[PDB]
Paper text:
The cohesin complex (Smc1, Smc3, Scc1 and Scc3) safeguards genome integrity by ensuring correct sister-chromatid segregation during mitosis and meiosis. The topological entrapment of chromosomes by cohesin is catalysed by the cohesin–loader complex Scc2–Scc4. Functional studies have revealed that the in-vitro-loading activity of Scc2–Scc4 resides in the C terminus of Scc2, in contrast, Scc4 is likely a chromatin adaptor for targeting cohesin in vivo. To gain further insight into the molecular function of the cohesion–loader Scc2–Scc4, which has such broad implications for both chromosome biology and genetic diseases, we determined the large modular structure of C-terminal Scc2 and derived a pseudo-atomic structure of the full-length Scc2–Scc4 complex.
Author numbering: 423 to 538, 544 to 570, 577 to 629, 637 to 652, 663 to 903, 913 to 948, 951 to 1037, 1041 to 1064, ...
The structure:
Amino acid sequence: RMKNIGKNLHITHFSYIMLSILQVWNNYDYCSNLVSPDTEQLHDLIAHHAATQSDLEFAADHIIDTILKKCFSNISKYRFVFDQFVTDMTTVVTLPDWPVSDLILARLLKKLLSIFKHINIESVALQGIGLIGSTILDIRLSSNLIHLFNYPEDIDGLFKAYRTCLAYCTNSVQHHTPYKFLWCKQLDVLTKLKEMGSKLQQKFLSLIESIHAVEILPTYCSTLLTSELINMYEPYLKLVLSLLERHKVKLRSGAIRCLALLISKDKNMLYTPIVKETIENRLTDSSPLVKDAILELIELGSSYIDFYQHININYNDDSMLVRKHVLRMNQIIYDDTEDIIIKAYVASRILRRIEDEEDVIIETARSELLKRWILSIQCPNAKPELQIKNCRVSIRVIAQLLVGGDKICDLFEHFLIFYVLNKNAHTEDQNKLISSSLCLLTDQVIEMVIENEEEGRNIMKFLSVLSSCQDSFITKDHITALYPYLHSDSDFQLHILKVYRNTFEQLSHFKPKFLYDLETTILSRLPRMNVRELDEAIPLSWSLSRHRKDDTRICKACASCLGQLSPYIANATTDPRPDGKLQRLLYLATGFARFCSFENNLKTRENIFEYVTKCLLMFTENIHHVIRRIATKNLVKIASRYPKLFNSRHVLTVLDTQFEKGILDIQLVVLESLYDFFLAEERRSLISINDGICSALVSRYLDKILKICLIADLNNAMVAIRFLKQILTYGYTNPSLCVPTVIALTASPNSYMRDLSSEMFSELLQGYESMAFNCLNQGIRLGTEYAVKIRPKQFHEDSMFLRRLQQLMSTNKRNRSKFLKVVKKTVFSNYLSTSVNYEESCYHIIYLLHNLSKISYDNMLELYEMLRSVISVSEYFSDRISERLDGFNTAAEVSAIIVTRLSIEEFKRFMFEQHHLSEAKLTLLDDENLRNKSVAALDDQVGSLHMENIFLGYENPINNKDYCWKYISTLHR
């Protein structure tokens, strides 16, 4: 049973009648018979309309109350009498036939907002309130009274809009009191203005004077923007946004549906400050499913380019779901904006996802970059001139992308070499398009640099990456056109040299006149070039040498270089200094020696590289420190190209001298340079090889390299451990020479070293299990010594060294007890034996005792048998302290023994507290022992040893007479 209205619309009879009844609460009958403009009978009229309003406001409240209290008593049966009511009101608000409805919804919305009671109510209220909010926005979009306060101009226009709606009323159906009540809303706006002189009164009087379907909807809605209803929009908006933080899922989800409805009706919503702020806040601090929900809401607008920076907070989120979502939106942003710095930003995050745990996300990230940068260039849909315009934005984007990040450049080069130009990754038609597209792309890269002569030098960096490809698409006419800008001068010159160096190793048959003038330009500027461009120009000069089939000019530049050294080698056979010019000419002389390859020049018969080493040996401890470094660095670099030099007693005695004398800046360059040699060895075993020489070098310097891994300065220690890594994987040594050092490094407080160590040790465990166990002893000892050495005051803060080893190594019946047997032998044979000097070892014993607290003894017997042993050692120490004060410089040893005794005591007390633990089970031997083998144990943190019980507030207890006295005071108490 529902009642017909105009356009096939029904309402429950209850609401139909009730709205009819409340619309008689009006005062236009008073107003109509009022003829004379009695200034005294007008302020009378306001008191009667104000009475009419507060009355039916009270009446509206009380009907709103009872309906709710009835619906919310059993929110299981009356669902759709509540949702029927809200659907009735929202239906009729847009009609001038029913002007009281705006009041009803206004006070209904007030009461539902105050609910935010059982979730069954809240979620039902939450849906109705979303329907009310929805239609508030409907009205507001179709074609404002504090606005009238400032500009009373538009009060005239407002009643004009009313006048049309009253005109519309007259037509149909039973319209008498609808016209009436609607008329009094005109009088209503003016009394709400006076709430805030005679400018309203004459408008008031001229209204009293004037009593003698979807085309109106925009106009009628214009009147409703003065009402209370529409002005409740923002407090409703403020609420639903706040609901995105509530813990209850049905509120959050109901909030999502509320905003989804709003955003799809008005899309500029997202940028209104209140929602923008909340969306941005929820993207940082929220769960994965709320983050995804916020991202889907953003997606409901038209463009959301401005949100790009907050969207990508979660580009690397832990959730695959959110990572997939952000990737999808980075694509839309990229295709939407025309801004290069935006495109490169979002493309950077797409490119980063080619390294991802999910293979699906990889192929998505790869394909969409390939589609956009490569295959887009030759679209079946022409024209050609749009094609190059797409080509150029791609170049601008990539060039900007390559600016900044070493990581992102490596990712781009990987994407280019191992995906784009990998013909097994694509179909045959695609490889054709890729080859065609890249050809046109590199050509446009060239045109863009020449036309340009921060964009330009970034494009030149891109060109060098393209040039380093297998078969580049740079041609002889391209490299001819670039020649003017090899002369003119930042890193622009290094990159163009790269392009030349690489292209001349690929193209052949150049014009001889161009080859000649290029060879002049390079060899002229060789003196004034830095090291990194020499490492390109000198090989390029050699390439030009062979293209010319003429080596005379390269030799002339080389001999000129060696001549300029003759003053310094003369002053090297005497002695002092260096400054600016000698440095770059040792790099230049070395440069020639390694990249060429000529044989003869005009001084003494020789090989040029043998001459250059003899000069370098002259600068390798008399000579100034900064030049020896460069000389020794370059000497190893030459020996890397001619490994037979590593047999010379002269150069070896140079390497000998630098490893022992220990200076860190020289030692470092020796280590990286030798490291580069051993890496080159591996690359060339995967295709000359020289295993005997490398084994010779390992046998001499391995001892000293292992030492550098455990020194304090991590510059040398990092290069050393990476050197050691290469030595192991290639297999020059028996692994056991290195495993003690790798175990030791797992004790590092440094994050990188401790991680890098543990995978190397995991790697050696699978390959050589039983050998690693034979090295566990020395590993522990070098471990504790290293730990204590780096952090002398704070080493004890890491008690998990031995436990990390136990978890790595104890994955077996026999392995779990072998690790325990070794740890027991080490502690007692090496640290608590009579051969130990406790002055040197007390801090080591402390570090260990911590770690022995957090290991797992597997069963109670191994644990109880342990404390049995340490207490025996403790009482032993007690007897030896009792022998000292039993007859009194000797403070050093007693302090060391006191410290070591208290350490054992603190250990035993901590173990008793944290585990069980009973003196009664401890003191008794013998069935009862096997009754302890069958109870189990592991441990946690929980907390560490109390060190106040060992140091007794002393500094530095060792050789501290006050510390000794304090302990002695605690004996004869």
